[PDB]
């Protein structure tokens, strides 16, 4: 619901959605080839 959103806001008024109290499966975003770049700072993408 955030990555496949219908319309993104302008940078002057960026949106902030809070995600909590759930099980987050991070394997779909890592294996999906639809992303042009996926560079993580702080934590490694494979241990997430």
């Amino acid at each position: 619901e955030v990555f496949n959103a219908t319309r993104f806001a302008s940078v002057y008024a960026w949106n902030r959605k809070r995600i909590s109290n759930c099980v987050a499966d991070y394997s779909v975003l890592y294996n999906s080839a639809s992303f042009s770049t996926f560079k993580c700072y702080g934590v490694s993408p494979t241990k997430l």
Binding site: A33, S36, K39, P45
Partner: protein, 48 residues
């Protein structure tokens, strides 16, 4: 030109599109993870 080596191997392959920069030590991505992975202490040069 002055130094000497015991053996040299030339690995030749073609890559098209983006990610061409990913051919380097300690790099991540679809190409570096599934296609061609260079060692951490690689000593040599890449020409394209």
């Amino acid at each position: 030109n002055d130094l000497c080596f015991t053996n040299v191997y030339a690995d030749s392959f073609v890559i098209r599109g983006d990610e061409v920069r990913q051919i380097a030590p300690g790099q991540t991505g679809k190409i570096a993870d599934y296609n061609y992975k260079l060692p951490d202490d690689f000593t040599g040069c890449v020409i394209a």
